[PDB]
Nucleic acid binder design. Structure first.
Ligand SMILES: O=C(O)c1cn(C2CC2)c2cc(N3CCNCC3)c(F)cc2c1=O
Ligand SMILES: O=C(O)c1cn(C2CC2)c2cc(N3CCNCC3)c(F)cc2c1=O
Ligand SMILES: [Mg+2]
Ligand SMILES: [Mg+2]
Ligand SMILES: [Mg+2]
Ligand SMILES: [Mg+2]
Lengths: 487, 245, 487, 247
DNA sequence: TCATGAATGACTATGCACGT
DNA sequence: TCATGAATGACTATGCACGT
């Protein structure tokens, strides 16, 4: 029996927990804004073909595939993570297209795994766009049987778009979601002004990103908190719901709440005001009635007494309920395996850097693949010019190994190219088919020259990020939901 | 008029209308379905009571054991009426009791278990036509450009498909016709536009003609005598298709 | 609103439930001895490639694949069904190779889905043998997306081997498991004596199937109950555990129970004797100690008082505990979509019929494919005999269609053969490859001759069942476990 | 000294042993019901008892004492150990002279260990001082040779070593089934748990030692206490050098 | 003291037939 | 009354950091 000191054990074990939680559970990678469970679910669904071009697969299959290949944890909590990515009130831009009962903004829980179906959304398809072209580093999974992506291509700024909230050890993150169109403008500026310093970049990006854009709409009151978050990485953003005063036929007034701030449970909100009225906290209120439905959305009617002022009751609601509540912004994300609190210019810059990396790597992959195709095509063209000989040789060969070795010697060709000649079908010996091989060579060499040109010009590389992102925003960008007002 | 909860079952999502004549209770199979129903309902007149698992057979089980069953107590408490001799229709909190179960066989089974509870404990609810059966959809035709259509049978599916194609409409052969295998697979919107919207929903009102004949059939099908039930099935299962011909 | 009478509704709904439960849930198909969920789990795993030639897949993946394609029900109860099929104390011949904690014969529950892995067993691979050769009818699944098998080939008598217990409506089944080697002998006799009447067949099969062979070993007392079950389809078979009296060093006798009858919970058994002794109903017992372990198996030590006779205490245990308990046999299985109580000669005969159907269908499929392959080969040989010409025509063609149409004219060929010539690689123009094509034609024509002979001779068909089953038994057959004694 | 074991006033989850001598008795505190289940089967029921713990244990450093005593998992530990807590602690009533903590090799197992060690150090310190607390080291790999007996490895290094030696010895492994990798105790069966963690002739135990009580008191308070900042600065300061604690 | 969310599943009740 | 075995998921408690 080996002896071990409790201090050595406690320190080693707790740090091991803290670090993996920090880097590998609770906090988002800055480049794609994803935690490991998110990234692994999406890749599992992607690899399984659960894409928008096919009908929703049973969500149990997505969970099981994630479990069996990438995420060595429980099916229960994995389903919860998948479910979240499909809720329009949780994600500003949902990554999972859910079919069935995925719960509500209230206490109505989502249906069980067995009852729901799911697939990737079109925007999630942009997260994974060209992942198969060596655009991101892959590492072996938890048992080395298969490969998993270290990060996704993320062809739209997902961290800022959908935001992130996570509790780690010694620290926690809380990034709000943003409007895709505003983020795109910030990226477009960062691309054009690629030499601008942090001082200028922050000023530019802050002018284009006017503030967080919550899926639950609502209001943002003030501008200080927003500015703090972007300049410090920390800030308290004041949120509000939307209240519209209605009058009655008798002459009674009632307050109608149609929106609530981000991450406010609708049922807990109604329960809170009810408990604050019975005990005696919000006088002036006469009746609380939830007239909400699937067709009118949120609609909480607060009938007030005849001796009550509408704004007084509304101000009391702001004070004593989450009708007005603050978002504690803390811009914490993993950068190169290290947790770091970031300014808004850093969040954009780091993302832009990732996009340039993705496209240079894609170009390199395509350029390598093009040369291989060109290489084999050159071998075929040599065979066609001496076709009368090539056939005679293969025929006169006792084996295919003798036939191969002969092809190398005659036409001065590689063994890979020589193999391709052997693998050639009798179809490709037709007149027009011989011509297709010729033209295809000319086609690729033009393509190779183009690809080489991209790698040699940083201008084009930035241009591709811009142009490709622009298409995504034009297709999947939407209006702002959260309205920004002053004090 | 009677007060709605805002002393009743915890599972009950009561309505807002305090008039039983205007109120409806949807007894739903499953928590998932009941959950989405609670969202897609008309909260003014429609209440939801989700039932979990196979209902206890009141024909087989002893009376005291039935009263200990949480799911039965939920029904009895929510309906407001008593049971057996202490039954009082005057306390009926909902003048429309809609049983909503899956189209599958287990939904059919749960229906017979509920109808058995009602017929044995609260028969007047059936006699006075307060009991109904919601018919869920089986298919959802998702046209590429046109509004989606719901079908409640294989025949209607074939018909609506034929008409649409003849009209020049088109469907994806991937997404295509979504087939419902239960209420739990539906969302709030779908349940409203097929089972809860009073202007399109397909309800069936349970009628009771020959009380004596019904009394016997309940005892044969739901009673403890297996032999009687075994012979009845082997005798009549051959001809179930031809009951309405 | 349409009116409906309660009698009409009750009758239609309850019968629809009863019939589906009877035919499609609770009772086994006579041909493969499988209920729908079993058949669907096994085919899901099979189609997913979860076979003994690969490492155990996470059991969640098997459930999800079963759930998502074939079995429209809950993940929880499906896992329980998969698990049971992996327990050596439940199935006489397990169909699932389980890796992890799959529970115990006692109250120790199986591990959760997330913790266990699973794959098909070699014997389960015989259940599915050549299922892809049109050996069984396939029907559309629950949503018409994919096809599923109505029944498995079942190349060993699984119903009798593994048995079946199920509660339906108006009826229930309870077939005990049997020794595979004994079942095979019965099948071998049924094949040889294929014209024998039911009177002779029952006598023959009863002599070879000596009785049930339980996975839990134990004893069978008497012969009447077994005989009743085979001749009537109903019988009460008396089971017993194994008790060994040991004499302590300090003049102390103790009963050691090392085996229990089929489906007796070890923990409930110990609890029963403990509760029947802490009151006064099993006097003579002094102490109860469970010395069981993973290494010695079951070992329940019952120390008895000195003024107590061992045999008296054992008889008291037989009477007041499940140390002696009866198996209520009820040989009920679905035959052609109809529930039927069967004699042992009927159970064997129906299985043999299924095997003959499987092999005739297999032969037909192979003969059709052989004719297709031979058909194309005939085209290739024609191309080789006029190879110099074949090349010239394809060259002068503007399209491949002009080249094809010419091949038909040259060699008098179909469109299928000509296309096959077109798809031919230059690989095969080597000397040995040209000869390989020739010999391959001769091989198939030899196979077609063989296959045609199979279809024309029922003798060979029966011979294939015998020989192939014989291989299965020699490999996967084991010793008897349940010992049969007299009164 | 001898004490009665449960057989048809102790925790319901406890699978007690048969031996009434604490000096010869052992309590395996196990992570997870699945693992505890297999442990209950593969154990030596004579001397080894199993107490499965479910979920992350409550932090006694952060939580108030009254809340800790209401926690079902803590009550199970305290009740099973038989000793009191704090001032009413009595080693004489200790029902097991070997308290083996058995958690997954993964990061979450390490966390549970620190939560258990915190419970012990704060409520029942003498158990640590007197060397009654141990840490079982589970296997990470199982090498399944085609013809030879399977070997267990407790590290990536040992895996590579046993693989090299066996291949050098002329043995062979399937490249499919091959080396089974354990991701937790729940994936193991009864036999495997016996032959790697519970067999006293093969098990790899580590006895928790307590040298500097004052230094330990501080480290527990920093890592497990309510002060986040103190914990944050400690991690950022010392995490960089965790690899080099034993170099 | 409650919410967040990614981590560490056992327990609870019925239908159904049949034998104790 | 209990076991069998396929059928019809919600509830329950902690860690972790932070703000009302
Ligand atoms: O899939 C499963 O195994 C289960 C499904 N359900 C639900 C009904 C669909 C259950 C419901 C239970 N409750 C019934 C009502 N009273 C409380 C308990 C239950 F105890 C177990 C299960 C399952 O195991
Ligand atoms: O996978 C999951 O979601 C859960 C896993 N576990 C287990 C620990 C691995 C739970 C354990 C719970 N208990 C902890 C101990 N006291 C009783 C409750 C619990 F309430 C919920 C869960 C889960 O949701
Ligand atoms: Mg959970
Ligand atoms: Mg259903
Ligand atoms: Mg269950
Ligand atoms: Mg673990």
């Amino acid at each position: 029996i080996e002896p071990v000191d409790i201090e050595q054990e406690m320190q080693r074990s707790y740090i091991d927990y803290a670090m993996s939680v920090i880097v590998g559970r609770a906090l988002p990678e800055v480049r794609d804004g994803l935690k490991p469970v998110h990234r692994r679910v999406l890749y599992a669904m992607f690899d399984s073909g659960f894409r928008p071009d096919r009908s929703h697969a049973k969500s149990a299959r997505s969970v099981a595939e994630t479990m069996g290949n990438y995420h060595p944890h429980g099916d229960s909590s994995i389903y919860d993570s998948l479910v979240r990515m499909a809720q329009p009130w949780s994600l500003r831009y949902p990554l999972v297209d859910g079919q069935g009962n995925f719960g509500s903004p209230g206490n109505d829980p989502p249906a069980a795994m067995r009852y729901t179906e799911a697939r990737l959304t079109p925007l999630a398809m942009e997260m994974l766009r060209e992942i198969d072209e060596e655009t991101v580093d892959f590492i072996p999974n938890y048992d080395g049987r298969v490969q998993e992506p270290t990060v996704l291509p993320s062809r739209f700024p997902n961290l800022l778009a959908n935001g992130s909230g996570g509790i780690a050890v010694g620290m926690a993150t809380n990034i709000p979601p943003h409007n895709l169109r505003e983020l795109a403008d910030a990226v477009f500026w960062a691309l054009e002004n690629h030499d601008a310093d942090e001082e200028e970049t922050l000023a530019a990006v802050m002018g284009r990103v006017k503030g967080p854009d919550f899926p639950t709409a609502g209001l943002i009151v003030g501008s200080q908190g927003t500015a703090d978050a972007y300049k410090t990485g920390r800030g308290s953003i004041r949120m509000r719901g939307v209240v519209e005063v209605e009058e009655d036929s008798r002459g009674r007034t009632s307050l109608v709440i149609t929106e609530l701030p981000y991450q406010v449970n609708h049922d807990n909100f109604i329960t809170s005001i009810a408990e604050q009225v019975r005990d005696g906290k919000l006088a002036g209120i006469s009746n609380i009635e939830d007239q909400s439905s699937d067709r009118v959305g949120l609609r909480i009617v607060i009938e007030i007494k005849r001796d009550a002022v509408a704004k007084v009751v509304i101000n009391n609601l702001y004070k004593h309920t989450q009708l007005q509540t603050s978002f504690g912004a803390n811009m914490l994300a993993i950068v190169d395996g290290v947790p770091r609190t970031l300014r808004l210019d850093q969040l954009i810059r780091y993302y832009v850097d990732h996009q340039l990396d993705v496209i240079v790597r894609r170009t390199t992959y395509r350029l390598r693949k093009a040369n291989e195709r060109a290489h084999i095509l050159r071998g075929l063209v040599k065979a066609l010019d001496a076709l009368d000989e090539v056939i005679a040789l293969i025929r006169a060969s006792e084996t295919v190994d003798i036939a191969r070795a002969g092809l190398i010697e005659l036409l001065d060709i590689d063994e890979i190219q020589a193999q391709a000649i052997l693998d050639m079908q009798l179809r490709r010996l037709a007149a027009l088919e011989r011509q297709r091989i010729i033209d295809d060579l000319a086609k690729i060499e033009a393509e190779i020259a183009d690809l080489e040109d991209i790698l040699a010009k940083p201008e084009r590389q930035r241009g591709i990020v811009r142009d490709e992102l622009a298409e995504i925003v034009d297709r999947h960008g939407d209006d702002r939901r959260t309205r920004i007002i002053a004090i | 008029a009677l007060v709605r909860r805002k002393g009743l079952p915890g599972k009950l999502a009561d309505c807002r209308s305090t008039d039983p004549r205007k109120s409806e209770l949807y007894v739903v199979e499953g928590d998932s379905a009941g959950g989405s129903a609670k969202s897609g309902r008309d909260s003014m007149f429609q209440a939801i009571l989700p039932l979990r698992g196979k209902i206890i057979n009141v024909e087989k089980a002893r009376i005291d054991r039935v009263l200990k069953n949480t799911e039965v107590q939920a029904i009895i408490t929510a309906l407001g009426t008593g049971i057996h001799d202490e039954f009082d229709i005057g306390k009926l909190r909902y003048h429309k009791i809609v049983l909503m179960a899956d189209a599958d066989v287990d939904g059919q089974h749960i229906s017979t278990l509920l109808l058995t509870l009602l017929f044995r404990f609260m028969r007047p609810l059936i006699e006075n036509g307060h009991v109904f059966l919601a018919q869920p959809p089986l298919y959802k035709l998702k046209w590429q450009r046109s509004d989606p259509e719901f079908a409640y049978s294989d025949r209607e599916r074939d018909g609506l498909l034929e008409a649409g194609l003849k009209a020049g409409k088109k469907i994806n052969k991937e997404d295509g016709i979504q087939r419902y295998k239960g209420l739990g697979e539906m969302d709030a919107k779908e349940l409203w536009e097929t089972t809860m919207d009073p202007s399109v929903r397909v309800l069936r009102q349970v009628t009771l003609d020959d009380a004596a004949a019904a009394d016997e059939l309940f005892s044969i099908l739901m009673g403890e005598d297996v032999d009687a039930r075994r012979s009845f099935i082997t005798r009549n299962a051959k001809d179930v298709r031809f009951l309405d011909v």
